[PDB]
């Protein structure tokens, strides 16, 4: 695929925001949810799941560029 065109700026902004401020906000929300739901039932496995999800988010642009030429 080609990253340029009429929608090149939108794709660039989305890719930068995936690991940028919106992605960091979503990760912080994940951490907040993990901490909050652990008040009654402490479960640190959800922290590992959130870490894996943040790892996927960090590699989301690479996966998208690999699958879509």
- Length of the chain measured in residues: 69
Asked whether the beta carbons of 1 and 68 are under 8 A apart, the reply is: yes
Contact of residue 20 among a second copy, ligand LHG, none (CB under 5-8 Å per partner type) = a second copy
Q: From the list a second copy, ligand LHG, none, pick the one residue 19 interacts with, judged by a Cβ distance below 5 to 8 Å according to partner type.
A: a second copy
Pairwise CA distance, residues 17 & 12, whole Å:
8
Closest separation in Å from C-beta 21 to a second copy: 4
Chain positions contacting a second copy, by CB under 8 A: 1-11, 13-40, 42, 44-69
């Amino acid at each position: 695929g080609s990253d340029d065109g009429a929608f090149g700026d939108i794709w660039a902004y989305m890719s930068e925001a995936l690991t940028g401020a919106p992605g960091k906000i979503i990760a912080c929300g994940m951490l907040f949810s993990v901490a909050y739901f652990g008040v009654v039932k402490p479960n640190l496995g959800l922290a590992l799941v959130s870490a894996l999800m943040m790892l996927v988010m960090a590699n989301g642009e690479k996966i998208i560029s690999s699958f879509l030429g």
